[PDB]
Design a protein around this ligand. Sequence first.
Ligand SMILES: [Mg+2]
Ligand SMILES: [Mg+2]
Ligand SMILES: [Mg+2]
Ligand SMILES: [Mg+2]
Ligand SMILES: [Mg+2]
Ligand SMILES: [Mg+2]
Ligand SMILES: [Mg+2]
Ligand SMILES: [Mg+2]
Ligand SMILES: [Mg+2]
Ligand SMILES: [Mg+2]
Ligand SMILES: [Mg+2]
Ligand SMILES: [Mg+2]
Ligand SMILES: [Mg+2]
Ligand SMILES: [Mg+2]
Ligand SMILES: [Mg+2]
Ligand SMILES: [Mg+2]
Ligand SMILES: [Mg+2]
Ligand SMILES: [Mg+2]
Ligand SMILES: [Mg+2]
Ligand SMILES: [Mg+2]
Ligand SMILES: [Mg+2]
Ligand SMILES: [Mg+2]
Ligand SMILES: [Mg+2]
Ligand SMILES: [Mg+2]
Ligand SMILES: [Mg+2]
Ligand SMILES: [Mg+2]
Ligand SMILES: [Mg+2]
Ligand SMILES: [Mg+2]
Ligand SMILES: [Mg+2]
Ligand SMILES: [Mg+2]
Ligand SMILES: [Mg+2]
Ligand SMILES: [Mg+2]
Ligand SMILES: [Mg+2]
Ligand SMILES: [Mg+2]
Ligand SMILES: [Mg+2]
Ligand SMILES: [Mg+2]
Ligand SMILES: [Mg+2]
Ligand SMILES: [Mg+2]
Ligand SMILES: [Mg+2]
Ligand SMILES: [Mg+2]
Ligand SMILES: [Mg+2]
Lengths: 294, 159, 139, 33, 169
Amino acid sequence: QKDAKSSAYSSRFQTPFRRRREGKTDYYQRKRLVTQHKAKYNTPKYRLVVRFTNKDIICQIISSTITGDVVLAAAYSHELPRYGITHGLTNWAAAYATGLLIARRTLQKLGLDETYKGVEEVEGEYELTEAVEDGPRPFKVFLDIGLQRTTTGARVFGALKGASDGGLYVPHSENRFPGWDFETEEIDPELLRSYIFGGHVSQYMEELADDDEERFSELFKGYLADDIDADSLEDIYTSAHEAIRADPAFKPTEKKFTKEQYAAESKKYRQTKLSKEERAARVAAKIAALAGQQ
Amino acid sequence: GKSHGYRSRTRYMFQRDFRKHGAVHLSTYLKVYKVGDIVDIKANGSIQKGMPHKFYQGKTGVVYNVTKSSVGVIINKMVGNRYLEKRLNLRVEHIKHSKCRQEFLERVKANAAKRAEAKAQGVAVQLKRQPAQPRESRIVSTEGNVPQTLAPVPYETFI
Amino acid sequence: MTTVSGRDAFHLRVRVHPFHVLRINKMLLQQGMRGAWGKPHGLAARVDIGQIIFSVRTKDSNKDVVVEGLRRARYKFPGQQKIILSKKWGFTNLDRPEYLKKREAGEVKDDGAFVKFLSKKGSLENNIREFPEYFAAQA
Amino acid sequence: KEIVKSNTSSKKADVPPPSADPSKARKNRPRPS
Amino acid sequence: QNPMRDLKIEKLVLNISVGESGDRLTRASKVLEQLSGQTPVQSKARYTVRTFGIRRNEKIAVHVTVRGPKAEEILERGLKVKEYQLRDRNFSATGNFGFGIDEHIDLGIKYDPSIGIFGMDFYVVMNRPGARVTRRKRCKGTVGNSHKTTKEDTVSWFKQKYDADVLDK
RNA sequence: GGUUGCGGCCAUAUCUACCAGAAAGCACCGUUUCCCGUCCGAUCAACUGUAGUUAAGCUGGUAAGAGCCUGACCGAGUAGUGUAGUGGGUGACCAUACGCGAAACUCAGGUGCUGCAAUCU
RNA sequence: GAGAACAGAAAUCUCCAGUAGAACAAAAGGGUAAAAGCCCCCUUGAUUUUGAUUUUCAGUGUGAAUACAAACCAUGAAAGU
RNA sequence: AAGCUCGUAUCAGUUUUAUGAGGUAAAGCGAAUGAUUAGAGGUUCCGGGGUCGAAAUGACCUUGACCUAUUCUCAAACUUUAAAUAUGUAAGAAGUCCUUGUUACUUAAUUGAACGUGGACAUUUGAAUGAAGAGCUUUUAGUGGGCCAUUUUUGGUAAGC
Ligand SMILES: [Mg+2]
Ligand SMILES: [Mg+2]
Ligand SMILES: [Mg+2]
Ligand SMILES: [Mg+2]
Ligand SMILES: [Mg+2]
Ligand SMILES: [Mg+2]
Ligand SMILES: [Mg+2]
Ligand SMILES: [Mg+2]
Ligand SMILES: [Mg+2]
Ligand SMILES: [Mg+2]
Ligand SMILES: [Mg+2]
Ligand SMILES: [Mg+2]
Ligand SMILES: [Mg+2]
Ligand SMILES: [Mg+2]
Ligand SMILES: [Mg+2]
Ligand SMILES: [Mg+2]
Ligand SMILES: [Mg+2]
Ligand SMILES: [Mg+2]
Ligand SMILES: [Mg+2]
Ligand SMILES: [Mg+2]
Ligand SMILES: [Mg+2]
Ligand SMILES: [Mg+2]
Ligand SMILES: [Mg+2]
Ligand SMILES: [Mg+2]
Ligand SMILES: [Mg+2]
Ligand SMILES: [Mg+2]
Ligand SMILES: [Mg+2]
Ligand SMILES: [Mg+2]
Ligand SMILES: [Mg+2]
Ligand SMILES: [Mg+2]
Ligand SMILES: [Mg+2]
Ligand SMILES: [Mg+2]
Ligand SMILES: [Mg+2]
Ligand SMILES: [Mg+2]
Ligand SMILES: [Mg+2]
Ligand SMILES: [Mg+2]
Ligand SMILES: [Mg+2]
Ligand SMILES: [Mg+2]
Ligand SMILES: [Mg+2]
Ligand SMILES: [Mg+2]
Ligand SMILES: [Mg+2]
């Protein structure tokens, strides 16, 4: 746009870290998440990485190495069909579920799962997972929110309440869970319990089917097609935790085609890069092409 | 009046490298430091806390302490006619494991092993370094190589 | 030069600039040597041995008038300076042969004052645009 | 309610920018009649 | 090609520059409050100007941002006054465009002397679908060249709808 | 091999222009009851994954492209410099002896590599 | 840089470019871009105990500083600070 | 000066190998900053002055200003680059590996981190050269006007300054 960058500009230009350019990593908060008390040496601070894409929820338990970060366990919301949840796969209730699953999943493969059960009751209470006096301290993790905005009622703190209630000691506070009254400076565990069981989505389904038959039958086209009634929602989630705690361990998907096979097909849509020889050839052509006052 | 402040004379010493300003990467915080470790010192001027004084720039010492965000390094400082012993508290951003120390340990392992294999044949070793010896005889061949013979070149200006 | 062989018959350029300031003390009881840092006194151009001082370009046959023009400035300069005529076209680089090859090839386009050169570096729609004469059928 | 836009700028000095300066103008100007 | 890069009004910002604090400002605000049904934001002087009479950090002007259908109708009410004719100026090199009107009563709006008459600035900024790529917090990106709004494009947008005229060179 | 989440090193990764991209993913994108934040549901928050689209982000390809990276008996053993002499010169300065040795220049090659985990005709 | 009534070189509004060419009380130098800068929200770690250490150094004092220990607090979802 | 504890050892105004730190010399300025000579092209649709239909919210023009690609020259308090000479540390017994003991610190954790028991390796035990012996304590004299040479270098016209 005739704002052409000089060479002066280009040359003295110092680039950000790659993932900074990409708008993915916030290195100022990564430092403070990753860094260990130097007198705790090689003991890893573990991160509860929670991420939301438009259609999925990603949950990872990660630690860092010079040669790269390292994931202990991961759970996804796209796993939840297996545990009986097939809709609203990025809503609040989906968080608490995937947050639960990652919890139960890690300290399963840690042996911590037989001790430290979590809550099982689940009534939206603010509480941490206190340590079994006179034995192993609970597996401790810290919430990596990434670039998510700390708003009070944010999906990302769903996965927090699911991961705390899952037995993982994950240090946190009330004031960002749904149902915190900044005037009351107090939490209503009702609203929070509700949100854990998709209570805010159910109410809406009713509101809609009652007041807008056409719209509801579109936003929730998929519920009609499965005979899922609104008020049956809570049971889906309830029986899901159930199913989750019951078999938290991870089964991978079965896959068609070999790991290698995909490759041999995939990017044969890979535009192949030229060799210097035909490159020069290319231009020695291009010259004659333009070599004339037009 | 003369001026001898704490960071005097360090306009270039505590300067960042060209096109290497801003955020210090995370390798620097992931490195682990034990007592007895040998570290180089090289201040990062963006980390104003726990800087070495400018003297200790480029000096190398031993860890005597590992605290939360820092190490204590022991530096032997010459003052007068005797070496004095200095306790330094540096944040990790101003410290670096010494390579030549890491090579030494590799050679210690290497030396143990060469010693194993040798003794596991009762044979001799020579485990210690010898310096660059002279040169044994050679026979250069002249095939493909009949000595191009050079000579000095005349003077010649060209402006 | 401008009188003996006419104004538009040469280009004479001074190739050193008087960039370096000189000071004096100036002894205005006379003050002494106390606080002896100088006021600026005048400018000088710090010149190396081998460094060009005056350069003149002119027509191949004005040589004699032009040299005499330098050996006349010379007497106004401390120290010894040589008058050297340069096997080289004008204020360009390129020894006169080499300059001519590049002219009979069309790589040299009269930029104002000096001149521009055609590279094998840039984008063609510029190199071709800037130097048509280099890539034309015309001999 | 009363709302006030925030000025992202750093400048703090009560000073018109070099974008001021009464050189540059017109002898012209819409002079009414 | 032409599927989804369909091009529309991003927003419309009405600006009344009162050039002085106090009542005359609070009134021009009401005007801007009624027209948009939003609460307007007043702006403050960036520095003292003596020949204008403004003190730095004095409240001086007031503006409001409108998006979607209500902008599309105030844009209309405004093009009405300009008699569907703008110049070949008004249209910036970055796909946007604007115009100004004296007295706001020329676009609906009852007189009311408790307020009085104010003119204002219309400036509509135009983008296309996908502009949030440059707006979001994460992975903030920038709109590919072939996308994104130009003066060529958004003039002959303004012509084909509105059926309006763009004059001069 | 593609893709995504978290990364290491932080331009061989940046900049400009133009093409291309199967599949999945990512995205744009639909909506405003609910928690939540705006002058403005634009950003931020929540809801659907449903109505839509690769247009853009993104990914690669192109370019006697800008930058950056690597190399070379390209300049150059040049400039500078450690040591030596009852060396040269009126001097500025210079050469020799035992050694070290650049930059600008020129040309040639290159244009992200890579760790954990999930996933994909 | 391109754009909008009164509105002008200079008022307020929009877009685009922008490696810092700004700002960080002060001298200058270093340092800093999802900040160290601008707006905002909450705050008294500008606190309590007495030791170790770096600079100047005699390895005295002073001023200034750095890293812990034991408290008591502030902030943030938190790691942290 | 008086000695004392020991006696091959731990040393060293030195080299080597390994690995650090530096911004001076040079160099650079069609790289950043600050300078500096000259044209050339291009914008004014937005400083200015006319000439042309006084016409001019119209052209051709010269003038600046800025823009672009070039050009001659510079820096103790400029700089990407960047020597030489100087300069830190290391080259093992106070070491290495194996087993596993302590603790109130630390870890999700018999995890670590410190410090140890028991076992194993004494030919070159981990470069060169030298060592006229190493270590150590106490006390006390004189001195506290300096000057000169090579090189580096500040002030000064300079000086046996
Ligand atoms: Mg260039
Ligand atoms: Mg943050
Ligand atoms: Mg551990
Ligand atoms: Mg704990
Ligand atoms: Mg409420
Ligand atoms: Mg001084
Ligand atoms: Mg300094
Ligand atoms: Mg360096
Ligand atoms: Mg930066
Ligand atoms: Mg401080
Ligand atoms: Mg004075
Ligand atoms: Mg003479
Ligand atoms: Mg401000
Ligand atoms: Mg601005
Ligand atoms: Mg709403
Ligand atoms: Mg919220
Ligand atoms: Mg939206
Ligand atoms: Mg959102
Ligand atoms: Mg992306
Ligand atoms: Mg190139
Ligand atoms: Mg020489
Ligand atoms: Mg020499
Ligand atoms: Mg002699
Ligand atoms: Mg003599
Ligand atoms: Mg010489
Ligand atoms: Mg703000
Ligand atoms: Mg302090
Ligand atoms: Mg320098
Ligand atoms: Mg210096
Ligand atoms: Mg120099
Ligand atoms: Mg250079
Ligand atoms: Mg310059
Ligand atoms: Mg040149
Ligand atoms: Mg010079
Ligand atoms: Mg000086
Ligand atoms: Mg210098
Ligand atoms: Mg030494
Ligand atoms: Mg004495
Ligand atoms: Mg005495
Ligand atoms: Mg005395
Ligand atoms: Mg000497």
